[PDB]
């Protein structure tokens, strides 16, 4: 756990091959380069992974709702985008309980 004042943000447009819909999304560069980032496409109402560094969904045992419950974001129809640079310990716990 640490803190810094050098966590800028960048915009990236991705073409949704699902509904052939394109949209731009801005997220923390630190969270994207070193962390998990989720973006929702304003057409098919759905979040997609762009850069997984925390391997949160890689555990195929966590839902998008859980990730929000860990952060605090109560609203989901607000921005439809979330960034993670340092996942909690309560989450990883459920991913590391069977193996000990």
CB of 7 to Zn ion, least distance (A): 28
CB of 19 to Zn ion, least distance (A): 4
94 binds Zn ion (CB under 5 A): no
Q: Are 29 and 7 in contact (CB under 8 A)?
A: yes
Nearer to Zn ion, 28 or 80 (CB): 80
19 is in an annotated binding site: yes
56 binds Zn ion (CB under 5 A): no
44 is in an annotated binding site: yes
CA distance 2 to 41: 32
CA distance 3 to 8: 14
CA distance 14 to 63: 22
Binding site residues, Zn ion, CB under 5 A: 16, 18-19, 21, 41, 43-44
């Amino acid at each position: 756990g640490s803190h810094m004042v050098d966590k800028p943000k960048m915009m990236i447009a991705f073409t949704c091959k699902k509904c052939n819909t394109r949209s731009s999304h801005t997220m923390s560069k630190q969270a994207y380069e070193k962390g998990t980032v989720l973006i929702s496409c304003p057409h098919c109402k759905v979040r997609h992974l762009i850069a997984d560094h925390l391997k949160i969904f890689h555990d195929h045992h966590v839902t998008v709702e859980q990730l929000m419950k860990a952060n605090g974001e109560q609203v989901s129809q607000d921005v439809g985008d979330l960034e993670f640079e340092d996942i909690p310990d309560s989450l990883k716990d459920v991913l590391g309980k069977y193996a000990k």
